[PDB]
Design a protein around this nucleic acid. Sequence first.
RNA 1: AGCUAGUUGGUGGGGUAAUGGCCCACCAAGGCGACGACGGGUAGCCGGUCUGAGAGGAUGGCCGGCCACAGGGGCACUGAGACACGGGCCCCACUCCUACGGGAGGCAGCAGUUAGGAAUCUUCCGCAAUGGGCGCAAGCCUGACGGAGCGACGCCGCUU
RNA 2: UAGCGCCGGCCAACUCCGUGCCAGCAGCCGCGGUAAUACGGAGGGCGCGAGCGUUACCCGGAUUCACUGGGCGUAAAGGGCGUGUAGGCGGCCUGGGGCGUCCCAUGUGAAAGACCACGGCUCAACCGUGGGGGAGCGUGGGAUACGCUCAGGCUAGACGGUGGGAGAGGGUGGUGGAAUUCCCGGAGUAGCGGUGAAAUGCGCAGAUACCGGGAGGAACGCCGAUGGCGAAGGCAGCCACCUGGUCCACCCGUGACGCUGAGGCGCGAAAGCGUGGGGAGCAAACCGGAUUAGAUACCCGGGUAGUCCACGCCCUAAACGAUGCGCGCUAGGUCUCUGGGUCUCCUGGGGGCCGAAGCUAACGCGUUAAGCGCGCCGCCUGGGGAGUACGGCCGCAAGGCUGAAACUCAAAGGAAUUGACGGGGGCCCGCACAAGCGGUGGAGCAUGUGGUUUAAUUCGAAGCAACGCGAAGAACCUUAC
RNA 3: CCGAGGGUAGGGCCCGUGACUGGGGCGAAGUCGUAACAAGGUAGCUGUACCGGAAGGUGCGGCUGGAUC
RNA 4: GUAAAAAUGUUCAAAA
RNA 5: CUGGCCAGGGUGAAGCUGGGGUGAGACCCAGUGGAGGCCCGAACCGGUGGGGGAUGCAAACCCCUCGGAUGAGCUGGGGCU
RNA 6: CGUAACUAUAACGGUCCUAAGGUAGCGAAAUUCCUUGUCGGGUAAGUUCCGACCUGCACGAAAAGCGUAACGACCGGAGCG
Lengths: 97, 124
Amino acid sequence: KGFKDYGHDYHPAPKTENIKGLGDLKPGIPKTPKQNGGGKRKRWTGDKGRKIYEWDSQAGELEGYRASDGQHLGSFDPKTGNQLKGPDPKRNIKKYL
Amino acid sequence: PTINQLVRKGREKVRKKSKVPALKGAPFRRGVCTVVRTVTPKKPNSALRKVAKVRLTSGYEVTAYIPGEGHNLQEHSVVLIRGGRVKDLPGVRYHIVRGVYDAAGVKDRKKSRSKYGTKKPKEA
RNA sequence: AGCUAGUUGGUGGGGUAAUGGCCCACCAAGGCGACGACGGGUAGCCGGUCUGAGAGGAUGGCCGGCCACAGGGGCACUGAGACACGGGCCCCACUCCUACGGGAGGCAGCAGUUAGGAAUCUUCCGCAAUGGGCGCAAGCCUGACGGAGCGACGCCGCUU
RNA sequence: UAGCGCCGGCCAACUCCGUGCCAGCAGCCGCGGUAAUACGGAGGGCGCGAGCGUUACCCGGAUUCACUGGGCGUAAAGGGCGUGUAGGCGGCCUGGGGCGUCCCAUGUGAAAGACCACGGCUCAACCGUGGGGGAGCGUGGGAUACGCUCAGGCUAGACGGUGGGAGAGGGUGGUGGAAUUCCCGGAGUAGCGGUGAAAUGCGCAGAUACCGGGAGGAACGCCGAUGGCGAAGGCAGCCACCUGGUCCACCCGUGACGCUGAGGCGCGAAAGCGUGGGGAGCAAACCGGAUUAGAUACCCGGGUAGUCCACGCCCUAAACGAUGCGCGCUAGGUCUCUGGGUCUCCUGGGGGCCGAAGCUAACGCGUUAAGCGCGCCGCCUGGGGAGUACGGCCGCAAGGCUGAAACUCAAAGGAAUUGACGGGGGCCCGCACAAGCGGUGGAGCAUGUGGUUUAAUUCGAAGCAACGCGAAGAACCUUAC
RNA sequence: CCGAGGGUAGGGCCCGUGACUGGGGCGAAGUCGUAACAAGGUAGCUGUACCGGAAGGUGCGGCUGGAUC
RNA sequence: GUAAAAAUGUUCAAAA
RNA sequence: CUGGCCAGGGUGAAGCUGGGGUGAGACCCAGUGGAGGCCCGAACCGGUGGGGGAUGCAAACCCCUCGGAUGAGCUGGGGCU
RNA sequence: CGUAACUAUAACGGUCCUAAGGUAGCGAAAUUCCUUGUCGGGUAAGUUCCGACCUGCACGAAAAGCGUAACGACCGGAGCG
Ligand SMILES: [Mg+2]
Ligand SMILES: [Mg+2]
Ligand SMILES: [Mg+2]
Ligand SMILES: [Mg+2]
Ligand SMILES: [Mg+2]
Ligand SMILES: [Mg+2]
Ligand SMILES: [Mg+2]
Ligand SMILES: [Mg+2]
Ligand SMILES: [Mg+2]
Ligand SMILES: [Mg+2]
Ligand SMILES: [Mg+2]
Ligand SMILES: [Mg+2]
Ligand SMILES: [Mg+2]
Ligand SMILES: [Mg+2]
Ligand SMILES: [Mg+2]
Ligand SMILES: [Mg+2]
Ligand SMILES: [Mg+2]
Ligand SMILES: [Mg+2]
Ligand SMILES: [Mg+2]
Ligand SMILES: [Mg+2]
Ligand SMILES: [Mg+2]
Ligand SMILES: [Mg+2]
Ligand SMILES: [Mg+2]
Ligand SMILES: [Mg+2]
Ligand SMILES: [Mg+2]
Ligand SMILES: [Mg+2]
Ligand SMILES: [Mg+2]
Ligand SMILES: [Mg+2]
Ligand SMILES: [Mg+2]
Ligand SMILES: [Mg+2]
Ligand SMILES: [Mg+2]
Ligand SMILES: [Mg+2]
Ligand SMILES: [Mg+2]
Ligand SMILES: [Mg+2]
Ligand SMILES: [Mg+2]
Ligand SMILES: [Mg+2]
Ligand SMILES: [Mg+2]
Ligand SMILES: [Mg+2]
Ligand SMILES: [Mg+2]
Ligand SMILES: [Mg+2]
Ligand SMILES: [Mg+2]
Ligand SMILES: [Mg+2]
Ligand SMILES: [Mg+2]
Ligand SMILES: [Mg+2]
Ligand SMILES: [Mg+2]
Ligand SMILES: [Mg+2]
Ligand SMILES: [Mg+2]
Ligand SMILES: [Mg+2]
Ligand SMILES: [Mg+2]
Ligand SMILES: [Mg+2]
Ligand SMILES: [Mg+2]
Ligand SMILES: [Mg+2]
Ligand SMILES: [Mg+2]
Ligand SMILES: [Mg+2]
Ligand SMILES: [Mg+2]
Ligand SMILES: [Mg+2]
Ligand SMILES: [Mg+2]
Ligand SMILES: [Mg+2]
Ligand SMILES: [Mg+2]
Ligand SMILES: [Mg+2]
Ligand SMILES: [Mg+2]
Ligand SMILES: [Mg+2]
Ligand SMILES: [Mg+2]
Ligand SMILES: [Mg+2]
Ligand SMILES: [Mg+2]
Ligand SMILES: [Mg+2]
Ligand SMILES: [Mg+2]
Ligand SMILES: [Mg+2]
Ligand SMILES: [Mg+2]
Ligand SMILES: [Mg+2]
Ligand SMILES: [Mg+2]
Ligand SMILES: [Mg+2]
Ligand SMILES: [Mg+2]
Ligand SMILES: [Mg+2]
Ligand SMILES: [Mg+2]
Ligand SMILES: [Mg+2]
Ligand SMILES: [Mg+2]
Ligand SMILES: [Mg+2]
Ligand SMILES: [Mg+2]
Ligand SMILES: [Mg+2]
Ligand SMILES: [Mg+2]
Ligand SMILES: [Mg+2]
Ligand SMILES: [Mg+2]
Ligand SMILES: [Mg+2]
Ligand SMILES: [Mg+2]
Ligand SMILES: [Mg+2]
Ligand SMILES: [Mg+2]
Ligand SMILES: [Mg+2]
Ligand SMILES: [Mg+2]
Ligand SMILES: [Mg+2]
Ligand SMILES: [Mg+2]
Ligand SMILES: [Mg+2]
Ligand SMILES: [Mg+2]
Ligand SMILES: [Mg+2]
Ligand SMILES: [Mg+2]
Ligand SMILES: [Mg+2]
Ligand SMILES: [Mg+2]
Ligand SMILES: [Mg+2]
Ligand SMILES: [Mg+2]
Ligand SMILES: [Mg+2]
Ligand SMILES: [Mg+2]
Ligand SMILES: [Mg+2]
Ligand SMILES: [Mg+2]
Ligand SMILES: [Mg+2]
Ligand SMILES: [Mg+2]
Ligand SMILES: [Mg+2]
Ligand SMILES: [Mg+2]
Ligand SMILES: [Mg+2]
Ligand SMILES: [Mg+2]
Ligand SMILES: [Mg+2]
Ligand SMILES: [Mg+2]
Ligand SMILES: [Mg+2]
Ligand SMILES: [Mg+2]
Ligand SMILES: [Mg+2]
Ligand SMILES: [Mg+2]
Ligand SMILES: [Mg+2]
Ligand SMILES: [Mg+2]
Ligand SMILES: [Mg+2]
Ligand SMILES: [Mg+2]
Ligand SMILES: [Mg+2]
Ligand SMILES: [Mg+2]
Ligand SMILES: [Mg+2]
Ligand SMILES: [Mg+2]
Ligand SMILES: [Mg+2]
Ligand SMILES: [Mg+2]
Ligand SMILES: [Mg+2]
Ligand SMILES: [Mg+2]
Ligand SMILES: [Mg+2]
Ligand SMILES: [Mg+2]
Ligand SMILES: [Mg+2]
Ligand SMILES: [Mg+2]
Ligand SMILES: [Mg+2]
Ligand SMILES: [Mg+2]
Ligand SMILES: [Mg+2]
Ligand SMILES: [Mg+2]
Ligand SMILES: [Mg+2]
Ligand SMILES: [Mg+2]
Ligand SMILES: [Mg+2]
Ligand SMILES: [Mg+2]
Ligand SMILES: [Mg+2]
Ligand SMILES: [Mg+2]
Ligand SMILES: [Mg+2]
Ligand SMILES: [Mg+2]
Ligand SMILES: [Mg+2]
Ligand SMILES: [Mg+2]
Ligand SMILES: [Mg+2]
Ligand SMILES: [Mg+2]
Ligand SMILES: [Mg+2]
Ligand SMILES: [Mg+2]
Ligand SMILES: [Mg+2]
Ligand SMILES: [Mg+2]
Ligand SMILES: [Mg+2]
Ligand SMILES: [Mg+2]
Ligand SMILES: [Mg+2]
Ligand SMILES: [Mg+2]
Ligand SMILES: [Mg+2]
Ligand SMILES: [Mg+2]
Ligand SMILES: [Mg+2]
Ligand SMILES: [Mg+2]
Ligand SMILES: [Mg+2]
Ligand SMILES: [Mg+2]
Ligand SMILES: [Mg+2]
Ligand SMILES: [Mg+2]
Ligand SMILES: [Mg+2]
Ligand SMILES: [Mg+2]
Ligand SMILES: [Mg+2]
Ligand SMILES: [Mg+2]
Ligand SMILES: [Mg+2]
Ligand SMILES: [Mg+2]
Ligand SMILES: [Mg+2]
Ligand SMILES: [Mg+2]
Ligand SMILES: [Mg+2]
Ligand SMILES: [Mg+2]
Ligand SMILES: [Mg+2]
Ligand SMILES: [Mg+2]
Ligand SMILES: [Mg+2]
Ligand SMILES: [Mg+2]
Ligand SMILES: [Mg+2]
Ligand SMILES: [Mg+2]
Ligand SMILES: [Mg+2]
Ligand SMILES: [Mg+2]
Ligand SMILES: [Mg+2]
Ligand SMILES: [Mg+2]
Ligand SMILES: [Mg+2]
Ligand SMILES: [Mg+2]
Ligand SMILES: [Mg+2]
Ligand SMILES: [Mg+2]
Ligand SMILES: [Mg+2]
Ligand SMILES: [Mg+2]
Ligand SMILES: [Mg+2]
Ligand SMILES: [Mg+2]
Ligand SMILES: [Mg+2]
Ligand SMILES: [Mg+2]
Ligand SMILES: [Mg+2]
Ligand SMILES: [Mg+2]
Ligand SMILES: [Mg+2]
Ligand SMILES: [Mg+2]
Ligand SMILES: [Mg+2]
Ligand SMILES: [Mg+2]
Ligand SMILES: [Mg+2]
Ligand SMILES: [Mg+2]
Ligand SMILES: [Mg+2]
Ligand SMILES: [Mg+2]
Ligand SMILES: [Mg+2]
Ligand SMILES: [Mg+2]
Ligand SMILES: [Mg+2]
Ligand SMILES: [Mg+2]
Ligand SMILES: [Mg+2]
Ligand SMILES: [Mg+2]
Ligand SMILES: [Mg+2]
Ligand SMILES: [Mg+2]
Ligand SMILES: [Mg+2]
Ligand SMILES: [Mg+2]
Ligand SMILES: [Mg+2]
Ligand SMILES: [Mg+2]
Ligand SMILES: [Mg+2]
Ligand SMILES: [Mg+2]
Ligand SMILES: [Mg+2]
Ligand SMILES: [Mg+2]
Ligand SMILES: [Mg+2]
Ligand SMILES: [Mg+2]
Ligand SMILES: [Mg+2]
Ligand SMILES: [Mg+2]
Ligand SMILES: [Mg+2]
Ligand SMILES: [Mg+2]
Ligand SMILES: [Mg+2]
Ligand SMILES: [Mg+2]
Ligand SMILES: [Mg+2]
Ligand SMILES: [Mg+2]
Ligand SMILES: [Mg+2]
Ligand SMILES: [Mg+2]
Ligand SMILES: [Mg+2]
Ligand SMILES: [Mg+2]
Ligand SMILES: [Mg+2]
Ligand SMILES: [Mg+2]
Ligand SMILES: [Mg+2]
Ligand SMILES: [Mg+2]
Ligand SMILES: [Mg+2]
Ligand SMILES: [Mg+2]
Ligand SMILES: [Mg+2]
Ligand SMILES: [Mg+2]
Ligand SMILES: [Mg+2]
Ligand SMILES: [Mg+2]
Ligand SMILES: [Mg+2]
Ligand SMILES: [Mg+2]
Ligand SMILES: [Mg+2]
Ligand SMILES: [Mg+2]
Ligand SMILES: [Mg+2]
Ligand SMILES: [Mg+2]
Ligand SMILES: [Mg+2]
Ligand SMILES: [Mg+2]
Ligand SMILES: [Mg+2]
Ligand SMILES: [Mg+2]
Ligand SMILES: [Mg+2]
Ligand SMILES: [Mg+2]
Ligand SMILES: [Mg+2]
Ligand SMILES: [Mg+2]
Ligand SMILES: [Mg+2]
Ligand SMILES: [Mg+2]
Ligand SMILES: [Mg+2]
Ligand SMILES: [Mg+2]
Ligand SMILES: [Mg+2]
Ligand SMILES: [Mg+2]
Ligand SMILES: [Mg+2]
Ligand SMILES: [Mg+2]
Ligand SMILES: [Mg+2]
Ligand SMILES: [Mg+2]
Ligand SMILES: [Mg+2]
Ligand SMILES: [Mg+2]
Ligand SMILES: [Mg+2]
Ligand SMILES: [Mg+2]
Ligand SMILES: [Mg+2]
C-alpha cells in the first residue's frame, strides 16, 4: 500500500533478497546520483538482467529503466511485483549506465 | 562613536545562550528513556542513527544520541545524559554517557574506552 | 516614564544612649525624576580569585572583614550590650507524647540519617597546645581549636 | 602497579585487514556506496603518566562592543529634510582666582594574598621573617602652561548697514495660444479604426477626412541645456501683487553673540482617506478582441475611482550623491552658470568631466573627497525567521513609528578575474539557408537496431559522434548462447 | 490605638495550557505554472493602490543598482 | 527610438 | 388658531475670564457658565410583568410592579378633512 | 468527469451549457432538512447557550454585507446575593 516511516524522511534500500517482485534479482552498482540523495541509488538489474532497478527512497518504490536505451519503464512495489505508474517519458539513466 | 556618544551610550556587552539547557548548569543529568529508535541523518549523509527520547530530572524531556555499536536501551532504561550536539541529527543535542546506570558499555570495544564505558578487556 | 499622604518642609510634643516624619497632633504644599525616579528581573558586598600584553572581562567557594538570617512571621522582657540559633510570648505549618483536659520540639553547631541530585566525608581522638568563660586559686566547661579517619578533589615530592 | 587520550587537516604520530552512504565518526571543514592514513580490530607511532580523556561554566584567542583597539558610496550601517531645546564642544592678547590638572609632605590604603629576598619541614607543595611597591581618598604647602571661571581689549568666526545681481524658490489673483473630446452648422461618400497579422469596436440612422461656430478641462511646444533655483520633497506659457533663501562690491557698524543638536515643532513625491466642487484626456478595477496549452498579462477596442481645485488627514519611498552638518589644510588642467574689476586676464559663489599627493578590498573618490585633522548628532555588530510577534504611541482607515525571541543555516554577502551563456552587439566563414538537381519517409525485398517471443533467440555500441556498426563472408567452423 | 495573620472584593505583571487558526523552518524522482538572473524574451526594482490559483499583473510617482546600433 | 511568437527538465574528486 | 401645565434633585457642553504656551498659533489648565429628543423622580402622559376580576365596581376595571416625564412633551377652548 | 509522496482532499485539467455563473465577509445562523452534525468550553450531568470547523437541504452586500461604544419594561446562556 503506502509508506511506513517513523523518524526517517526517506525509505532505505531494502537489500534484495526480500524483493520478490521480479525474477532473478541481481544486484548492481551505486552510480546515478540522488535527488540530492547524498549519493547513488541501489540498482538490481534483474529479470532478464537486461533490466535495471534504482530506488525511490522518498517514494518507497523502485523504478525500472531498460538495459538498452536506458528509458524509465515503470515503478513497482518491492513487495509484490505489480507496477505503480506509466513509463515516464522524461528520464534517462544510461548516462550513469 | 564619538567619545561623548560612548559616555552617554556605552558598548554592548555580549551575552551567550547556553547551547545546552541540561539545566542546573550541571555536566550531566540522570534521565529515563521513554522512546528509543532510529532517526535518518541530514542532507549529505544517510544512515540510521540510534537515538533516545529521555525524561530528565530537570523536568525537560529531550532526545539524545547513543554512540557505539548496538545497545541495551528500552522503553524504560534509566540513563545519564552528557551534553554535546550532533550536527547531522536535527535537534539531537545531547549524548548518552554510554556505560552508566542502565546503559552498558560497547561490547567488544578495544580502542577508546574512557568513552563507550567499556572497561579493560582483560585478554592477557 | 512618570512617582509620591507621613508624601517634602515647619512648629510644639512623645520616643532613644542619641539626631531625625522614627511616631503624634497643628500648619505649609511641597519632595523625586531621561544626570533614568517609579516599576520588574536578578544578587549578600569586600580584601581578593580566574583569565588577559595590558586596559578589560568573569567572579566572591576556602581564609580575613562587614551585613543578614536561625522551620515561616510578629513582639517585647532581662540586660552595659540582644529583639537574642541551642532565652521568652503569640499565630501558622510539620513532629512526638496523652488518661483527649492538655503537653514537649527546632542540626543554617560537630558527626550521622533522610530526601533531592551529576555530586560532597568519621555518630573518631584530646583539652597537651592556642584562644574563650567563670574563679583568689586549685580547677571546671570548650564538637572553637589541635590532630587523626575517608575521597587522586587540587598542588607538590616519590616508586614500579 | 601502568594507564588513558590521539595518529585526515588545524595537530605531534602510518600501514594491513574488516566493512562498502551500511555499521559508524564528529569540534569545524567533512569521511563511508570495494584498494578508506577519517569508520571496527591489529601492528606500529605520538603525547602525557597515577593519571589520561569527556561534559558543564568563566577569561582567551574575539581589534567580533574596538578607552587602549574598529567602522557606515555599493559588504551590516547617515536620520527623507529643516528649525531648534537641554547637553557636548569653543578664535587672538593681558590681568585676577586657583576647581580641574601637575608636584611635595603627611594620614589611610588592616591581616592574608600577589612581587623581590633570606630562612624552616631531606626538596617541593605548603611555611616563618624582612623588603617593596598600591590606584582611591582625607588634611597642609606650592606651581598655573592647559581646561574652567571673574575682569579688560581686539577682529581673522558669526551677524549687521549700503548699493546692485541671477534664478522653473514659495503663495494669491488674472490671462494666451496650440491640441484632444463633446455639441451645433455646412460640404461630401464607403469605409474608418487598429495590429505582427487581426478582431472586437465605430459607420448608409451618413462615420473617417475638410471647413466654420461654441462649451469645457488639463498641461504648458520652440526657448530648454552635460542649464538654473531650493534644506529635502520638489519647482517651467505670460502678467501683477505678497514673500523666502542666496551671490558679488564697499571695509562703514557689533565685537566670539559661534558649531552641533537626544527630545520637541514645522515641512515632506506618488498612491491613499474624509467633506464639497470639477471631470477634456489618460486610466488601476472591470467588460470585450486577439495570442497562447492556459493568458485572471504583454498587444487592441471600451472604461470607473483617481488624476485636477479647496479645506483636513495620511507621513512612506531606490525620500539616492545609497556619501550628516560645520570649520581649517593638501597640484593643477579643462567648460559652464552667475557676479566684481587696474577686460589675451585677474578675482568670488555654484554646477560637470580628467585628474597631484593621498585613502581604498577593489570598483573608484580626489579643493563639490571616499584626502589630512578637530567638535556634535545619527546609525552598524553574521544569513533566515523579520521590519514579523507582543506591548506602547499615532491614524477615519489603509497603515505608520518603536521593535524582539524561539528555532534554523555554514553561510549571507561586497569587488574583481577567468570562462561559459545570452530570444546583447560588431566583423567573418562553412551545402547552414537561400538558388538548384536527385532522393529517403510511402510500397516489395535485403540488412542493422528496438521490442516481443524462446530451452537460448550470445556480447557490446545508444542524439549528432549506435543503428550494411564490430562482422573485410554465422550451414557444424565461426560461437562467446 | 497599633498589630502577625485570616477573610471578602477589585485591579496590575508573568507563567503554563486550549478546540481551532496564521504564518516561519526542514525533508531522498510530489502538483501547477515561469516571476527574477543575459534587453530572462513586457528592463528590473521601489512606496502605494486595485486585482488574479500561484508566482504575479496593471495604475500613479520614483530610482538606475538598466541594456542598446 | 522599435523584433510578433515559443515553459520546462541532471548531477561527484582528484594534486603535490 | 389661541391658551395652559411640567415639585425637587443630578450631570456640567459651548461660551466667556484669568494663568500657561508659541514667532504668532493650534492647544492645556483652573474659575465662571448652565447646554441637552441627557440622568433620578412626583404632578401629568403611559400600559411592562404578575395576581385579582370574568352573570365584574367596570361591555377593558383594581392592586403590586414597571416606561416617559424640556420634548418627535402633555393639555383646555376654537376650527378643518 | 479526472488528477498531488499511502489513503484524504484537489491548487491543476478536460468538457457541456449561460446573459453571467456568488467576490469580500459571514456560516448547523431570528437562515441547517439529515441534526441532540463534530470538536472544544461551561455543568456531577447541558437537544439550550458560548467558541470553533464550513458537504451553506435553502447566507451574501442599500428587500444592503460584516462589525460596532451607548441605549432596550425586547428574546437567549451563565454565575453571586
Ligand atoms: Mg532539485
Ligand atoms: Mg572611538
Ligand atoms: Mg537532545
Ligand atoms: Mg543491542
Ligand atoms: Mg536492540
Ligand atoms: Mg541489545
Ligand atoms: Mg535491547
Ligand atoms: Mg561540545
Ligand atoms: Mg533534540
Ligand atoms: Mg497622619
Ligand atoms: Mg518634630
Ligand atoms: Mg522633637
Ligand atoms: Mg537601643
Ligand atoms: Mg514617615
Ligand atoms: Mg527610635
Ligand atoms: Mg501627622
Ligand atoms: Mg498635594
Ligand atoms: Mg545627577
Ligand atoms: Mg537608564
Ligand atoms: Mg523585588
Ligand atoms: Mg538568590
Ligand atoms: Mg584593572
Ligand atoms: Mg584586571
Ligand atoms: Mg573586582
Ligand atoms: Mg559583585
Ligand atoms: Mg561554604
Ligand atoms: Mg586553605
Ligand atoms: Mg566554613
Ligand atoms: Mg568568604
Ligand atoms: Mg524566624
Ligand atoms: Mg530547616
Ligand atoms: Mg524570627
Ligand atoms: Mg543578659
Ligand atoms: Mg550583663
Ligand atoms: Mg533596658
Ligand atoms: Mg549577658
Ligand atoms: Mg536598650
Ligand atoms: Mg539580632
Ligand atoms: Mg542565645
Ligand atoms: Mg528569638
Ligand atoms: Mg541547633
Ligand atoms: Mg484527666
Ligand atoms: Mg519548656
Ligand atoms: Mg509549639
Ligand atoms: Mg550537623
Ligand atoms: Mg553526612
Ligand atoms: Mg543520598
Ligand atoms: Mg537519589
Ligand atoms: Mg573534613
Ligand atoms: Mg584547652
Ligand atoms: Mg586555657
Ligand atoms: Mg581571668
Ligand atoms: Mg570542683
Ligand atoms: Mg578541625
Ligand atoms: Mg593519594
Ligand atoms: Mg603528582
Ligand atoms: Mg589527545
Ligand atoms: Mg601532521
Ligand atoms: Mg594482506
Ligand atoms: Mg553491516
Ligand atoms: Mg575515534
Ligand atoms: Mg573488500
Ligand atoms: Mg579498506
Ligand atoms: Mg573512497
Ligand atoms: Mg587509520
Ligand atoms: Mg579522527
Ligand atoms: Mg581506523
Ligand atoms: Mg597499538
Ligand atoms: Mg602503543
Ligand atoms: Mg569566549
Ligand atoms: Mg593566539
Ligand atoms: Mg575583546
Ligand atoms: Mg576609537
Ligand atoms: Mg568592522
Ligand atoms: Mg544590497
Ligand atoms: Mg547597504
Ligand atoms: Mg541624506
Ligand atoms: Mg536609509
Ligand atoms: Mg535632521
Ligand atoms: Mg530632528
Ligand atoms: Mg521620520
Ligand atoms: Mg541646526
Ligand atoms: Mg548650550
Ligand atoms: Mg546650545
Ligand atoms: Mg589684563
Ligand atoms: Mg586666563
Ligand atoms: Mg595667579
Ligand atoms: Mg586646583
Ligand atoms: Mg598616599
Ligand atoms: Mg604610604
Ligand atoms: Mg596589604
Ligand atoms: Mg601593609
Ligand atoms: Mg588567601
Ligand atoms: Mg631560597
Ligand atoms: Mg623562599
Ligand atoms: Mg629552602
Ligand atoms: Mg630550607
Ligand atoms: Mg621556597
Ligand atoms: Mg609577607
Ligand atoms: Mg590666570
Ligand atoms: Mg570678554
Ligand atoms: Mg572692525
Ligand atoms: Mg523668482
Ligand atoms: Mg494660481
Ligand atoms: Mg495660472
Ligand atoms: Mg480649441
Ligand atoms: Mg467619456
Ligand atoms: Mg454634423
Ligand atoms: Mg454594425
Ligand atoms: Mg439603405
Ligand atoms: Mg440611402
Ligand atoms: Mg484651421
Ligand atoms: Mg472644429
Ligand atoms: Mg545637498
Ligand atoms: Mg528627483
Ligand atoms: Mg526676492
Ligand atoms: Mg530677494
Ligand atoms: Mg575688490
Ligand atoms: Mg568692516
Ligand atoms: Mg580693512
Ligand atoms: Mg571696520
Ligand atoms: Mg565707530
Ligand atoms: Mg570691545
Ligand atoms: Mg570696537
Ligand atoms: Mg499640521
Ligand atoms: Mg504627503
Ligand atoms: Mg496625490
Ligand atoms: Mg479626495
Ligand atoms: Mg465614506
Ligand atoms: Mg469627490
Ligand atoms: Mg466622464
Ligand atoms: Mg457627471
Ligand atoms: Mg482610453
Ligand atoms: Mg500572442
Ligand atoms: Mg501566448
Ligand atoms: Mg504559450
Ligand atoms: Mg507568452
Ligand atoms: Mg487598454
Ligand atoms: Mg485601455
Ligand atoms: Mg476603488
Ligand atoms: Mg477606496
Ligand atoms: Mg477623493
Ligand atoms: Mg523609515
Ligand atoms: Mg546630523
Ligand atoms: Mg565679467
Ligand atoms: Mg568653483
Ligand atoms: Mg568649480
Ligand atoms: Mg598617482
Ligand atoms: Mg595613487
Ligand atoms: Mg572621479
Ligand atoms: Mg579643483
Ligand atoms: Mg571641485
Ligand atoms: Mg562633481
Ligand atoms: Mg534606531
Ligand atoms: Mg540574527
Ligand atoms: Mg541567528
Ligand atoms: Mg512597513
Ligand atoms: Mg501593535
Ligand atoms: Mg486608536
Ligand atoms: Mg476610509
Ligand atoms: Mg500593527
Ligand atoms: Mg549584503
Ligand atoms: Mg557571493
Ligand atoms: Mg558584485
Ligand atoms: Mg533549406
Ligand atoms: Mg533546399
Ligand atoms: Mg537550398
Ligand atoms: Mg521529391
Ligand atoms: Mg520505405
Ligand atoms: Mg535487441
Ligand atoms: Mg532465451
Ligand atoms: Mg538475437
Ligand atoms: Mg541473450
Ligand atoms: Mg560482456
Ligand atoms: Mg545485442
Ligand atoms: Mg563486455
Ligand atoms: Mg552503448
Ligand atoms: Mg556505412
Ligand atoms: Mg484595629
Ligand atoms: Mg492590618
Ligand atoms: Mg491583610
Ligand atoms: Mg488569623
Ligand atoms: Mg488574606
Ligand atoms: Mg492577604
Ligand atoms: Mg485577591
Ligand atoms: Mg488578584
Ligand atoms: Mg501567553
Ligand atoms: Mg493563553
Ligand atoms: Mg499563551
Ligand atoms: Mg494565557
Ligand atoms: Mg496545537
Ligand atoms: Mg500551528
Ligand atoms: Mg506551513
Ligand atoms: Mg513573509
Ligand atoms: Mg517566505
Ligand atoms: Mg522539497
Ligand atoms: Mg525531485
Ligand atoms: Mg516543490
Ligand atoms: Mg521569466
Ligand atoms: Mg516582470
Ligand atoms: Mg521581464
Ligand atoms: Mg518584488
Ligand atoms: Mg507597483
Ligand atoms: Mg483601498
Ligand atoms: Mg488587470
Ligand atoms: Mg512606471
Ligand atoms: Mg506587436
Ligand atoms: Mg508554451
Ligand atoms: Mg515544473
Ligand atoms: Mg511539468
Ligand atoms: Mg537541474
Ligand atoms: Mg615537494
Ligand atoms: Mg462647575
Ligand atoms: Mg467646559
Ligand atoms: Mg498666551
Ligand atoms: Mg467652561
Ligand atoms: Mg441641567
Ligand atoms: Mg452652578
Ligand atoms: Mg429626558
Ligand atoms: Mg431614560
Ligand atoms: Mg423615571
Ligand atoms: Mg412613575
Ligand atoms: Mg404620589
Ligand atoms: Mg397643578
Ligand atoms: Mg398609546
Ligand atoms: Mg397614572
Ligand atoms: Mg397593567
Ligand atoms: Mg414584555
Ligand atoms: Mg400590563
Ligand atoms: Mg390581567
Ligand atoms: Mg389576569
Ligand atoms: Mg378564573
Ligand atoms: Mg417608578
Ligand atoms: Mg425619569
Ligand atoms: Mg426627553
Ligand atoms: Mg388642543
Ligand atoms: Mg371643538
Ligand atoms: Mg496507505
Ligand atoms: Mg492519492
Ligand atoms: Mg476549467
Ligand atoms: Mg469546469
Ligand atoms: Mg466577482
Ligand atoms: Mg469572482
Ligand atoms: Mg467565499
Ligand atoms: Mg453575525
Ligand atoms: Mg454551519
Ligand atoms: Mg450545535
Ligand atoms: Mg438557509
Ligand atoms: Mg439542527
Ligand atoms: Mg430540529
Ligand atoms: Mg449530542
Ligand atoms: Mg457533538
Ligand atoms: Mg458539546
Ligand atoms: Mg461538555
Ligand atoms: Mg468537563
Ligand atoms: Mg442550571
Ligand atoms: Mg435551563
Ligand atoms: Mg456558535
Ligand atoms: Mg460540513
Ligand atoms: Mg448559495
Ligand atoms: Mg440564495
Ligand atoms: Mg438576507
Ligand atoms: Mg437574497
Ligand atoms: Mg448587488
Ligand atoms: Mg439588493
Ligand atoms: Mg439592516
Ligand atoms: Mg452581524
Ligand atoms: Mg468601530
Ligand atoms: Mg452589538
Ligand atoms: Mg425605549
Ligand atoms: Mg424594550
Ligand atoms: Mg442564585
